[PDB]
């Protein structure tokens, strides 16, 4: 059969799931933790989140992470990817304001627990919360210094290599770049909110030409010094560091050769962005041509320590896209800074079908084939390095006028099916010379999903807010146990 | 070096509808400069005003003396079994004024419908190029040629011209090249400025530096483009039959990455586009590539949709011109660089030695010329699944023999062009290897026919399959390659 078999890849092989601090902590005040941009973004603009609501609570992790480390036990995964609130550790975002014990010991003990149980840990240092308190001091990402951000992200690394560098082996310095910068600057959906005027978003008096540009470079510049500060005295022989890229699928729209252009340039503002800074030190040449002086350029210095800037690289895969040509011409100009790819990118094929099927959200269409060809690219044209799809999955949709019985809500066949195809597609790739390592099902657990809010489960976990946020295993979560059960059985 | 019997040619390894032939060009055969009323050109008035400009400081002011050997010329295509011969016009010679009232010159008038009469006595099929770089010096005067800043005027008189070849030709001229080469002259006459006027940008070696080596090649490529456009639309609506085609001739020197990095791969891809696509593109889809608009930005002018509606698809065939090829090297955009020719800004050096320190293929004897017929085939697959895959015909192919007064070049040797048959016969199969694989190429054309002026190298190098000794009254005499094409075609 082509159902996925634990058989199917290497011994040393990884599979587990992956959540993030702000969609599954809550306790967003408590026991000293900082507010957050997110905290901010929410509790102003409840109208800019789906339906209205905030992550006070979300999957309350911070008080029920020993049922999160059980679960996960039980399924038998081998690791469990979760990030760690900048906030809830420095809650001034700085090493003037302090560091926060609670902090530090909650996500000890989470560390420690997983370990205990034979769970490798993946932390991803920083997963969108930024301390609010450096965003008023200076706008956080949008530090126009290139220092401010710089120093106290590198010191946040640093906090976080001296408390859990002796426990942690694997280490992701930023989640997806490329959504972050585009969604909280470009198209101003995600916290502070920030877009160009005429575009529609809580604060439209920023420029989503040049402000989501401004950000990606200092999140590269902060990557290089997190790196290079890890290298110089953290580094271990069995330890990796690199971050993980969300990325579409790209396919070109026609027949025509300018659309097979067009892809090109696709893939390289949606992942070639920060990925060929770090491979290389220096952002796509396509981007260069295109944005111009609104790109940032690196000093010698800067291109030196991001070259070569990880031991291993995350690639969050959910679905794919058409690429469409637009000519350089007097009658085009870009608006939003993912326009300077000169292309749009379609669901819709031209025969009016969409590119796969339909998993319920707005945007996830599965379309497996696109991840080959991602792992087809990594290989041949990145230097085929080390990859840990580090997020993957759909989200049912529930609201309020449109109730997701519980019942139906944990037999989500259509997340299992999606799950297995993926990774059956990783087979393939293994097969044709893919250097892949790793699979993370992204969301444990149901959580608060940004402006989506709670409109959208993505868990192989239910979790039932209506009642003290009781864990549930879905079909999916119970067909990943037995996935588990063994490396190699015997008789799948 | 030479190999094979089992893999030289052979004439029936192509169609019996294919096409085999030897080309020239006026400037640099015909000679009689200023003769029955001939108008000064381009070049006419480069080669005298500035003789160090030319590698031996030479002019073609007698060339070929093909004006008045023209007999021969047909004679020896017809003896070679040669299907074609691909020719231009001097559009001075025709018009001396280079202008609709400045009249039409009759003797010139006369002299290629003899010509073209002549070969189709013989059977040989002539291929016109109407323009080869050759433009009146009367026009440079006016309004400086194709650097027309109101791209109506070089429009207009470039029009004007061609009808006069269509008009007067077209009875018996089947097959049309509006240009030879646009890239090449652009690039080279207002880029780097080797060929006449010799602009370039200040502070730069050419005769004129005081142009704008980073514009002006645009400048002038849009025109041609512009009279190009125009040109094919007349004769379309006025002389167009079903069995007469026309085009133009691209000149392309093929790209190959430097190492195995991408960003090699992407320069390869930033090189095939200055060079080619430049003025393929145009013709094919009504726009520049991408890439250059992405990186000449506003120093490329853009296209109206009456012009860009009159670009799409003007042609019903396609030349290339086809040398040898280059490694392209990646060069970032970044602070520290900035492009100096127009060439620059594909941001790629184009090299001749390898990562591995070997040159592409073997030197063929001149400055640039290095043998690698994959480049070719390379080429073709391009054209096949990139472009459309028209029909296609190497108007040009073959080396220059160096032959300098320090370091001269005994006749016997020059006629034993063994190096010459080598290449030719290894480019000639390597057609027969791109037909198997799905090209649409119809023809080759042995580029000189006669040993001749070759523009800013002089008379330094011989390129024909055909001797001609300038000392002896122009006597042509059958080099090997020659001989060996004879026996292919009969």
Redesign the interface.
Same mark, same amino acid.
């Given at each position: 059969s082509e159902i996925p078999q634990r058989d199917w890849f290497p011994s040393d092989f990884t599979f587990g799931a992956a959540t993030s601090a702000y969609q599954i902590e809550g306790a967003w005040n408590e026991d000293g933790k900082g507010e957050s941009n997110w905290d901010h973004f929410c509790h102003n603009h409840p109208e800019r989140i789906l339906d209205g609501s905030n992550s006070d609570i979300g999957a309350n992790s911070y008080h029920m992470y020993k049922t999160d480390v059980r679960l996960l036990k039980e399924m038998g995964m081998d690791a469990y990817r979760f990030s760690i609130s900048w906030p809830r550790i420095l809650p001034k975002g700085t090493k003037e304001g302090g560091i926060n014990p609670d902090g530090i010991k909650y996500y000890r003990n989470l560390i420690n627990l997983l370990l205990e149980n034979g769970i490798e840990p993946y932390v991803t240092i920083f997963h969108w919360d930024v301390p609010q308190a450096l965003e008023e001091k200076y706008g956080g990402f949008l530090d126009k210094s290139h220092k401010s951000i710089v120093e106290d992200y590198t010191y946040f690394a640093k906090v976080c290599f001296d408390n859990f560098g002796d426990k942690v082996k694997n280490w992701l310095t930023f989640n997806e770049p490329q959504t972050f910068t585009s969604f909280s600057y470009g198209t101003g959906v995600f916290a502070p909110g920030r877009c160009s005027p005429g575009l529609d978003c809580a604060y439209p008096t920023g420029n989503s030409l040049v402000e989501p540009y401004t950000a990606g470079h200092n999140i590269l510049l902060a990557h290089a010094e997190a790196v290079d500060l890890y290298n110089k005295h953290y580094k271990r022989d069995d330890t990796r560091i690199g971050l993980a890229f969300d990325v579409m699928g790209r396919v070109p729209y026609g027949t025509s =050769?300018?659309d097979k252009?067009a892809e090109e340039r696709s893939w390289d503002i949606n992942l070639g962005w920060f990925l060929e800074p770090v491979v290389?030190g %220096?952002y796509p040449? /396509?981007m260069? /041509?295109?944005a111009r002086e609104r790109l940032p =350029?690196f000093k010698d210095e800067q291109k030196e320590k991001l070259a070569g800037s990880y031991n291993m690289l995350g690639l969050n895969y959910y679905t794919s896209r058409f690429s469409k040509?637009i %000519?350089? /011409?007097?009658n085009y100009s870009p608006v939003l800074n993912t326009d300077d790819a000169?292309a749009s990118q379609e669901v819709n094929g031209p025969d009016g079908k969409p590119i796969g099927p339909p998993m319920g959200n707005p945007w996830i269409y599965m379309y497996p084939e696109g991840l080959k060809d991602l792992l087809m690219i990594m290989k041949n044209?990145?230097g085929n390095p080390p990859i840990y799809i580090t997020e993957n999955g759909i989200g049912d949709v529930d609201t309020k006028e449109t109730p997701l019985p519980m019942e139906a809500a944990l037999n989500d066949y259509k997340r299992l099916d999606y799950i297995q195809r993926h990774i059956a597609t990783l087979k393939e790739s293994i097969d044709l010379g893919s250097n892949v390592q790793g699979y993370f099902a992204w969301s444990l657990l149901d959580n608060f999903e940004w402006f989506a809010g709670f409109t959208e489960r993505y868990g192989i976990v239910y979790v039932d807010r209506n009642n003290n946020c009781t864990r549930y295993m879905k079909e999916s979560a119970k067909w990943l146990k037995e996935f588990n059960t063994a490396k190699k059985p015997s008789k799948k």
């Open positions: =050769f300018l252009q290389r %220096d040449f /396509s260069r /041509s295109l =350029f040509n %000519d350089i /011409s007097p000169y044209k990145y």
